[PDB]
Design a binder for this molecule. Structure first.
Ligand SMILES: [Cl-]
Ligand SMILES: [Mg+2]
Lengths: 231, 244, 241, 243, 111, 204, 235, 240, 250, 4
């Protein structure tokens, strides 16, 4: 209230309101879901449009052949952060001939976001990210929030009404976690998870966005007629 | 951060005035009056000291009148310390011009650069303006004798006669009344002192509350001389015009 | 009143942030005291370890700045250590630049100047500390010089600092009134330490065990602090007196 | 007033309210502890299980510095990571210039000075963590706890977070009941118990235990995580005691 | 005096047909009168149906190829996965090379 | 390629009874080619006189520089700079350019207006002060000037005698140097009158 | 006061939201995308009849294959256009090809959030960016000061936008010819404009693959205006 | 460096510092520009609460930027010097690199760009000045008149006025200026300019300045009598 | 991090006062009285050494400082501010004068440099004005003896005699009665000692009074011989004993 | 430059 003027100010109960307001833009964001088995990891995102004459804002960005993410909240902030990830993955290849661990990607994003929560003049990032990838220790899903908190999960979801999907995934856990060697089944489960977050709307062909990465699949994105298979 | 404590010295009021310039001008209006009068054969600078104590060393003193080069001097109304900063800048600027062109700096050119410096403090940098108004008195071979004033806004204008500091309203009315174009220097000397005598907030004008300077062609043939009056010389010129 | 948050003048010509920095000086509730012998300078300070979980050996407000200079702080420990690290760096640099050991009084002046800057430049806060520097200077002999958040410093015959400082001060003034001299007329530093502890006991009206105190001694060519045992040895001798 | 709106401002009592507010963020966080032992140190922390979906064992919170130092913290997790990153640079540069690995007291002051630095200006915010850290150097074992103000001391045992009081009481008992010293493997078990006991004050969500240690004899003076049979064994010892 | 260049020998050759093109190079790598390797490839698949060799000073050759491969990667990232045409690759490589006009890559490049 | 002998020229200064003299030639050339016959090398700042030999561009630059510095000095100090003080200012200014110097051989001469003492000094290109009772020499014919001065000079000459002596030292030194000559000027300086005489000399 | 980069409690950037208000006060700009081209039309809105209206430049070339219309604080757009042109020409220098419309738009949008305490505030102008490229054909983009851009089949910006957008919603279909789209932009402009639409206070432009970006002269536009009244009268 | 964002947006979408800069222009002395068939005339009011002025040396209100282009203004006088200097430097730089003097549009666009830059740069306030820029492109005889303002927007005008009571004189010009028939000569155009100023000014004494610009660098300032004649001649046609 | 205070902390109020300068002068008002008197063959500057505790050794705290061998300074106001000004004043005498001209600056010019420093603390970003007024007494060959007062604003004035701080109003009146242009230096010392008793509460002796002169050259204080044109410092601090000698004949 |  008097303590929300900037990120460099704690409230008397030890809160950071600008960081909390940044978290709020994520909540207004269109829903997106992450989930993984032991062989693959999948992102599903509901794309949002301006009106019926407009495109449906992309929510999924490729970071490397083995890594990529989905976004919820401020899109330019996802562009900045995904671009940083591309560089970090890149640097790992050129210098060490090493594909960047998804866990390190997580740590690097956390530390980048954190700097903007402790210095005057900056501002926190206004976007949440779900990072998937396949590396030397298998499939991974991460959840990034602009407080700097990054968390590794079997599955999750973020954005408006993401609580529906996050509940569904919480029950479904024992099933989807063991969809190994079957891309299309893992995706189906992801599409069902996101459906628990729909209201007055359902998944159309230019509305749904899916991505998959895993053992012998480079991170690739499916849009348009390529997702009709799944509706 | 530190934004909390920033007065924002370089912004507009809703009326489109510069607060700090206005308030600086308000400060200057309580300063000792200084008068410049321009004749056909020279210029007078006269200024009233901020009210003396009997123990002040008055002869080795300078508060109002400063030499910029051999052909240009200024009279100050406002913060002395602020003025000295600007005076040394102006003195250096004069020398750069001479060094570059092997010719003494034209009066306006010097005046413009000083005024341009002041202007800058009102538009960028977030610093307070200089609380100073100058009367410039000088000679050059383009325009001859010239009087200018500049103020914290960095606006400058030229004059036949002008006052700055305290009671300029009364002083300007009196100069307007008695000034006339064909005037000699010695008449302008008298007008300057008579004007201060009537506008002063003191009981009576004495030698020890004044600074005085002339810029004449009154050396030898087609060249110019600055005379900064000694106390005894002011005491005499005060008698010579019957104010004491 | 934003003249209360940064180090600019108030209408009555005061610096509230400097004044409030002085109040932080007593936050720890410790009292310190320093006296000069013939050959030495002694500084003692109360040692209070509240929590049973603390490692008592790491709890100290006395610092060895150089081989010859010691410094005791009255104030919170983060500011105290900040000041000590700087003093150590300044004393080492001085030695390298000028080829001789930094004198106690010159270090005091230097730290005082640094403090003065924080009272004038807005972006730096004052440190909530009072620094008492002690040595046996090769030119000036036993020396005590003290710095505060205002950037003030001065040399002392003896001094005290803390909440119950005034008691200790007048106690010491009354001694020097009587003794008629500048210092503790004593040969060994062991007895000067004993004097220091003794007059601290009278002025504060409290007894001390070996773990209630903390002692630093400066002699010609070394400053050192005492162990719990050297202090116990010292408390024992005061009791047999 | 308004003294509490800007870091590095003294209030009229002589306090920096912004540091005090950072302490509230620390008190709000999960419980973490350290126990100093015969020839080393032990670190433990409670990881709240927000959901079934957190991959167990795979959100590691204890962090190593150099090869011989462990760090754990309660409060704002990213602030702690930032502090450890700086610690790693401080240790690297020490080792670079002086060859030997950084001594623990030396390391403690490096963090202390850096944290204290963030209470000097209004253009930065204090750290929202209390950090427990330590290890083994040429002079033996050291345990330290460091607060948002920059204040740190050496500890026999230390605790912070929501269960700090419960844990503190439990530590005080060990210090009294083991005055000749506690062994490394003893401390590992005790640490598990105390985290389970201090989990009382945070008990909506059940938790995951995480332990690490440096011991001159048990880990050769290097920081290692406790896993497998040793972790499960210490969990079991803790389970015994809350029943 | 330190000489930042060396010469790794070998030779390369490109021929273009109507609906195909070849880029060939020997696999020998040398310095002075010594053989470093009898099989060290210097012709590379760079993606988007472009092959590239940069022959002469191998260290410079490898650096350049690495930079171009990376250039192809970012071309996809920045222009919606668009295919990098051979004419566009060529022009991009000119800028890579000329960017070091005053400390050149000692290579003869063929794509 | 030696900047101190591209243009050529000389300066000499001498003390007498309550007077000083300073003289220079008027040649400015570009190696063998004589270009100007009017290039004076002596300047004054109030009552202090400065002669400068060496690279002509630096001679001009330094004159402009010391005019600048003495003008500001006068405005701030409210008095004319004295020779002892000016000598120090010359030294500071040259040494400030220690590793990229002005290729000059300056010479200062004048009478201190408080003490009445005659004063001369010479400098190397990087500021080293050479104060002397008797004479200072500078330029491409400095060897010759040293020879002429050391034999011709005697202490306490009257202004009109000093004039003859310094003139003969300059003239005969110039005539044994290919790069000096083409005219000459002599300043006779007394406590408050200064006479400037142009000498008639061989024009080859 | 309060930081320029501050979030509201709803999680929006105050300064970005306020710049969106400035854009609502701007003169109307409309674009329609067809398979035969993209039309861009704007309301000139001369503030006084003495001002020579042809000097009002709110439609602007970026490259031969990309055009731009603006609405809001139009002086803020100069540097955006300058950046766009440089980005387009530079790309052609580095790659010997035409730069994609989306890539161009993304480059301009990267400028948007580079403000703080970089520039001192967001831009107070929205852009309609229209072009053609071989990959994705004819395109229309709405570029906001938030850094966000949306592709549209048709879009209106400025004061008359909510009225005009509802109208474009009804009229747009996937088979509009270019000529139909030109008329439609003219029609919708006349509806939302204060003063009466003529060839001096509105302006038209298109970009086609074949002839690139062209701004229409007043003679050509006047005839499409005349053709539009005769279409409406006749039913 | 001093960094503060002084020109920022308010909740209604206004930039108050730019709008307040406009208020400073409104308070400034009146300036008017009228373009004939073959000339452009710049008229400027001078506020007459000032006698003892020295007009020889007092900064005139119309400034030559190059020998074929002039600039006048209303608003803060000190601010206007900065824009004029920058404009003058750019004029010479354009000649140096393009080997051609500036077009009036180009020079206007430059000045406008400077003004805009000061509305979204940290640590600076906007220029409290609007300008009228007039002249003829090189080797062209079609007259040009442009106006700029603090926000940075600029445009071309058949005739225009700025400063105090500019709405009164814009009112005048709007009913008295025929787009179809612009003042066919110098004499004609100067008159219309003086008439419009007489709506607002006072006496046409030492109150009005006029500067005429014809093609190929032909710029001349009228002096008192030459203007005075115009004043005299209009009031004698007024009693009707 | 770093100084983000690049804006002025001293600004004009609507009445035209510069608040921080006024408030700095108020801090000078609070300060202990100090004074200076100019004789025909010397200048005297004096002040009270008002000790903080009697355990403090107040010889270690010098309120009157040598700036050059012919120039001295004293102050009223905040001591720490004065200390760093003396440091800066000593250095600027070298860097901006002695290293250029090979001689020490004349009084007015050194004063001018100190004034510049104090003016900059009145306008530069992120600083407050100095909370002191200085009195600078000095001698130079072409100006003779002089006395200057420097205020927080950066303004300075030459005085025959004046006083600053606590009881300045009273002390200035006292000095108007006693001062004439024929005072020999010993007379000025005597008047200074009388003037100072009015404003001192407690002990009044050579241990509580600090007093220095600018007078004759002191060859015995030079430290070396053999350059006959170097004659020694005109600045001399009177000893505790020297003061007490003049207090018995008071 | 001279030497010593
Ligand atoms: Cl210092
Ligand atoms: Mg010859």
């Amino acid at each position: 209230n008097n303590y929300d003027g900037d990120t460099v100010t704690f409230s008397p109960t030890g809160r950071l309101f600008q960081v909390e307001y940044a978290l709020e833009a994520i909540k207004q964001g269109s829903v997106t879901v992450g989930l993984r088995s032991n062989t693959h990891a999948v992102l599903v995102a509901l794309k949002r449009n301006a009106d019926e004459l407009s495109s449906y804002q992309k929510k999924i960005i490729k970071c490397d052949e083995h890594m990529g993410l989905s976004l919820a909240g401020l899109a330019p902030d996802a562009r900045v952060l995904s671009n940083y990830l591309r560089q970090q993955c890149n640097y790992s290849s050129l210098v060490f001939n090493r594909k960047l661990a998804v866990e390190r990607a997580g740590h690097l994003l956390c530390d980048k976001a954190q700097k903007n929560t402790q210095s005057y003049g900056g501002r926190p990032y206004g976007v949440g990210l779900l990072i998937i990838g396949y590396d030397k220790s298998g499939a991974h899903l991460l959840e990034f929030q602009p407080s700097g908190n990054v968390t590794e999960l079997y599955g999750t979801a973020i954005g408006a009404r993401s609580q529906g999907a996050k509940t569904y995934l919480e029950r479904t856990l024992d099933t989807f976690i063991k969809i190994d060697g079957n891309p299309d089944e893992l995706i189906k489960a992801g599409v069902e998870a996101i459906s628990q977050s729909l209201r007055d709307e359902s998944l159309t062909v230019d509305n749904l966005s899916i991505a998959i990465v895993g053992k012998d699949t480079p991170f690739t994105i499916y849009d348009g007629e390529a997702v009709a298979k799944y509706i | 951060g530190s934004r909390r404590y920033d007065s924002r010295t370089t912004i507009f009021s809703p009326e489109g005035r510069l607060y700090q310039v206005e308030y600086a001008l308000e400060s200057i209006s309580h300063a000792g009056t200084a008068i410049g009068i321009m004749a056909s054969d020279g210029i007078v600078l006269a200024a009233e000291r901020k009210v003396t104590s009997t123990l002040l060393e008055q002869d080795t003193s300078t508060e109002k009148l400063y030499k910029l080069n051999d052909k240009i001097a200024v009279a100050v109304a406002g913060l002395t310390a602020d003025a000295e900063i600007l005076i040394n800048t102006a003195r250096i600027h004069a020398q750069n011009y001479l060094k570059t062109y092997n010719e003494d700096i034209p009066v306006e050119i010097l005046v413009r650069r000083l005024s341009d410096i002041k202007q800058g403090y009102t538009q960028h940098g977030g610093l307070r303006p200089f609380g100073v108004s100058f009367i410039y008195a000088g000679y050059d071979d383009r325009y001859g004798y010239q009087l200018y004033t500049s103020n914290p806004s960095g606006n400058y204008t030229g004059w036949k006669a002008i006052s700055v500091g305290a009671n300029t309203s009364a002083a300007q009315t009196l100069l307007q009344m008695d000034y006339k174009d064909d005037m000699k220097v010695d008449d302008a000397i008298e007008l300057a002192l008579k004007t201060l005598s009537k506008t002063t907030d003191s009981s009576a004008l004495t030698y020890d509350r004044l600074e005085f300077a002339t810029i004449r062609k009154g050396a030898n043939d087609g060249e110019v001389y600055q005379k900064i009056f000694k106390p005894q010389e002011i005491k005499d010129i005060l008698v010579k015009t019957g104010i004491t | 009143g934003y003249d209360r948050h940064i180090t600019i003048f108030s209408p009555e010509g005061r610096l509230y942030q400097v004044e409030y920095a002085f109040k932080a000086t007593n936050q720890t509730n410790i009292n310190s005291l320093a006296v000069r012998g013939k050959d030495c300078t002694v500084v003692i300070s109360q040692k209070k370890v509240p929590d049973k979980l603390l490692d008592p050996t790491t709890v100290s407000y006395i610092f060895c700045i150089s081989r010859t200079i010691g410094m005791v702080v009255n104030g919170p420990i983060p500011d105290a250590r900040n000041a000590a690290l700087r003093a150590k760096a300044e004393a080492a640099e001085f030695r390298y630049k000028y080829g001789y050991d930094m004198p106690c009084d010159v270090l005091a002046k230097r730290m005082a100047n640094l403090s003065q800057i924080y009272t004038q430049r807005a972006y730096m806060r004052p440190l909530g500390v009072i620094l008492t520097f002690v040595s046996v200077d090769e030119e000036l002999g036993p020396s005590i010089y003290k710095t505060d958040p205002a950037g003030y410093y001065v040399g002392y015959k003896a001094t005290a600092t803390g909440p119950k400082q005034q008691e200790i001060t007048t106690n010491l003034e009354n001694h020097f009134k009587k003794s008629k001299i500048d210092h503790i007329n004593e040969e060994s530093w062991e007895k000067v330490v004993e004097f220091a502890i003794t007059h601290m006991i009278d002025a504060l009206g409290t007894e001390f065990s070996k773990n209630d105190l903390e002692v630093g001694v400066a002699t010609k060519d070394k400053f050192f602090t005492l162990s719990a045992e050297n202090i116990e040895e010292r408390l024992v001798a005061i009791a047999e007196q | 007033t308004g003294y509490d709106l800007s870091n590095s401002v003294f209030s009229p009592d002589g306090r920096n309210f912004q540091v005090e507010y950072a302490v509230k963020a620390v008190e709000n966080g999960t419980t973490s502890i350290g126990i100093k032992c015969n020839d080393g140190v032990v670190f433990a922390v409670e990881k709240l299980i927000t959901s079934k979906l957190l991959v167990p064992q795979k959100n590691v919170k204890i962090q190593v510095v150099d090869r011989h130092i462990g760090c754990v913290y309660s409060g704002l997790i990213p602030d702690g990571r930032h502090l450890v990153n700086r610690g790693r640079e401080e240790a690297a540069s020490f080792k670079k210039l002086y060859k030997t690995p950084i001594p623990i007291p030396a390391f403690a002051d490096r963090l202390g000075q850096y944290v204290q630095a963030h209470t000097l200006y209004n253009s930065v915010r204090p750290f929202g963590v209390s950090t427990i850290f330590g290890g083994v150097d040429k002079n033996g074992a050291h345990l330290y706890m460091l607060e948002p103000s920059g204040s740190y001391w050496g500890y026999k045992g230390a605790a912070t977070g929501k269960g700090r009081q419960s844990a503190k009481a439990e530590l005080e008992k060990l210090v009294d009941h083991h005055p000749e010293g506690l062994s490394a493997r003893e401390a590992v078990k005790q640490a598990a118990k105390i985290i389970y006991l201090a989990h009382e004050d945070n008990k909506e969500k059940d938790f995951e235990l995480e332990i690490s240690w440096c011991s001159l004899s048990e880990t050769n003076g290097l920081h290692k995580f406790v896993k497998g049979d040793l972790l499960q064994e210490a969990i079991d010892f803790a389970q015994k005691e809350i029943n | 005096q330190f000489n930042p260049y060396g010469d790794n020998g070998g030779t390369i050759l490109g021929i273009a047909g109507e609906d195909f093109a070849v880029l060939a190079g020997d696999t020998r790598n040398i310095t002075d009168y010594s053989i470093n390797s009898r099989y060290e490839p210097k012709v590379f698949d760079c993606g988007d149906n472009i092959v590239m060799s940069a022959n002469g000073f191998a260290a410079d050759g490898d650096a350049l190829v690495k930079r171009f491969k990376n250039s192809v990667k970012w071309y996809h990232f920045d222009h919606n996965d668009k295919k990098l045409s051979i004419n566009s690759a060529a022009r991009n490589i000119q800028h890579l090379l000329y960017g070091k006009r005053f400390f050149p890559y000692y290579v003869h490049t063929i794509i | 390629s030696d900047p101190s002998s591209i243009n050529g020229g000389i300066v000499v200064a001498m003390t007498g009874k309550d007077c000083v003299a300073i003289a220079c030639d008027l040649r400015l050339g570009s190696q063998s080619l004589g270009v100007s016959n009017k290039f004076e090398k002596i300047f004054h700042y109030g009552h202090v006189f400065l002669g400068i030999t060496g690279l002509a561009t630096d001679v001009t630059t330094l004159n402009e520089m010391f005019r600048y510095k003495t003008n500001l000095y006068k405005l701030k100090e409210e008095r004319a700079i004295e020779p002892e003080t000016f000598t120090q200012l010359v030294s500071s200014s040259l040494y400030e350019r220690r590793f990229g110097p002005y290729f000059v051989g300056p010479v200062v001469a004048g009478i201190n207006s408080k003490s009445g003492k005659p004063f001369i000094a010479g400098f190397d290109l990087i500021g080293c002060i050479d104060e002397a009772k008797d004479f200072i020499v500078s330029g491409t014919a400095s060897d010759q000037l040293f020879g002429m001065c050391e034999s011709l000079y005697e202490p306490n000459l009257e202004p009109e005698d000093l004039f003859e002596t310094i003139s003969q030292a300059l003239l005969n030194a110039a005539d044994r140097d290919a790069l000096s000559g083409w005219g000459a000027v002599v300043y006779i300086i007394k406590k408050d009158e200064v006479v400037k005489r142009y000498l008639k000399m061989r024009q080859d | 006061d309060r930081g320029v980069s501050t979030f509201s409690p709803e999680g929006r950037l105050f300064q970005v939201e306020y710049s969106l208000e400035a854009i609502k006060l701007g003169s109307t700009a409309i674009g329609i995308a067809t398979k035969e081209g993209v039309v861009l039309g704007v309301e000139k809105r001369a503030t006084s009849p003495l001002l020579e209206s042809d000097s009002i430049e709110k439609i602007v070339e970026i490259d031969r294959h990309i055009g731009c219309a603006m609405s809001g604080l139009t002086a803020d757009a100069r540097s955006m256009i300058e950046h766009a042109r440089t980005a387009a020409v530079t790309h052609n220098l580095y790659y010997d090809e035409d730069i994609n419309v989306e890539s161009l738009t993304q480059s301009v949008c990267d400028l948007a959030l580079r403000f703080g305490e970089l520039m001192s505030r967001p831009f107070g102008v929205a852009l309609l960016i229209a072009g053609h490229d071989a990959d994705d054909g004819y395109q229309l983009f709405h570029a906001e000061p938030s850094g966000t851009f949306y592709r549209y089949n048709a879009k209106a910006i400025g004061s008359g936008s909510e009225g005009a957008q509802a109208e474009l919603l009804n009229e747009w279909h996937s088979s509009l010819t270019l000529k139909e789209a030109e008329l439609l932009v003219l029609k919708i402009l006349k509806q939302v404009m204060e003063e009466k639409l003529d060839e001096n206070n509105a302006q038209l432009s298109c970009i086609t693959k074949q002839d690139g970006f062209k701004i229409y002269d007043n003679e050509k536009t006047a005839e499409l205006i005349k053709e539009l009244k005769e279409k409406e009268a006749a039913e | 460096g001093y960094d503060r964002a002084l020109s920022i947006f308010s909740p209604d979408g206004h930039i108050f510092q730019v709008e307040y800069a406009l208020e400073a222009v409104k308070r400034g002395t009146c300036a008017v520009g009228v373009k004939g068939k073959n000339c452009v005339v710049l008229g400027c009011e001078r506020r007459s609460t000032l006698k003892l002025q020295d007009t020889r040396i007092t900064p005139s209100k119309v400034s030559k930027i190059d020998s074929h282009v002039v600039l006048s203004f209303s608003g803060l006088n000190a601010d206007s010097r900065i824009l004029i200097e920058k404009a003058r430097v750019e004029a010479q730089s354009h000649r140096l690199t393009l080997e051609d003097p500036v077009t009036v549009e180009y020079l206007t666009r430059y000045v406008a760009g400077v003004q805009q830059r000061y509305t979204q740069s940290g640590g600076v306030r906007p220029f409290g000045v609007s300008t009228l820029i007039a002249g003829f492109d090189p080797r062209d005889d079609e007259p040009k008149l442009y106006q700029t303002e603090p926000s940075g927007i600029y445009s071309s005008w058949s005739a225009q006025t700025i400063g105090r009571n500019s709405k009164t004189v814009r009112e005048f010009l709007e009913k008295n200026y025929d787009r179809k028939e612009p003042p066919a000569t110098v004499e004609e155009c100067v008159k219309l300019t003086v008439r419009s100023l007489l709506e607002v000014v006072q006496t046409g004494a030492k109150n009005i300045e006029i500067t005429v610009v014809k093609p190929d660098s032909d710029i001349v300032a009228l002096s008192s009598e030459e203007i005075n004649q115009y004043v005299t001649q209009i009031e004698q046609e007024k009693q009707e | 991090m770093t100084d983000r205070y690049s804006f002025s902390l001293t600004t004009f109020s609507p009445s035209g006062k510069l608040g921080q300068i006024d408030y700095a002068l108020t801090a000078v008002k609070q300060g202990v009285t100090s004074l200076g008197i100019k004789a025909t063959n010397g200048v005297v500057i004096a002040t009270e050494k008002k000790s903080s505790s009697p355990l403090a050794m107040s010889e270690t705290l010098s309120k009157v400082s040598l700036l050059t061998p012919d120039i001295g300074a004293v102050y009223s106001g905040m001591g720490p501010d004065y200390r760093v000004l003396v440091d800066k004043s000593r250095k600027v005498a070298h860097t901006s004068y002695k290293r250029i001209y090979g001689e020490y600056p004349p009084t007015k010019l050194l004063v001018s440099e100190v004034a510049k420093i104090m003016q900059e603390a009145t306008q530069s970003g992120g600083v407050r004005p100095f909370g002191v007024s200085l009195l600078i007494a000095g001698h130079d060959e072409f100006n003779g003896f002089s006395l200057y007062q420097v205020d927080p604003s950066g303004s300075y004035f030459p005085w025959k005699a004046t006083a600053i701080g606590k009881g300045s109003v009273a002390a200035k009146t006292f000095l108007e009665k006693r001062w004439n242009d024929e005072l020999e230096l010993e007379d000025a010392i005597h008047i200074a000692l009388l003037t100072l008793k009015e404003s001192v509460e407690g002990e009044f002796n050579g241990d509580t009074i600090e007093l220095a002169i600018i007078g004759d050259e002191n060859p015995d204080l030079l430290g070396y011989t053999g350059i006959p044109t170097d004659k020694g410092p005109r600045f001399r601090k009177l000893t505790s004993q020297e003061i007490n000698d003049r207090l018995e004949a008071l | 430059a001279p030497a010593x």
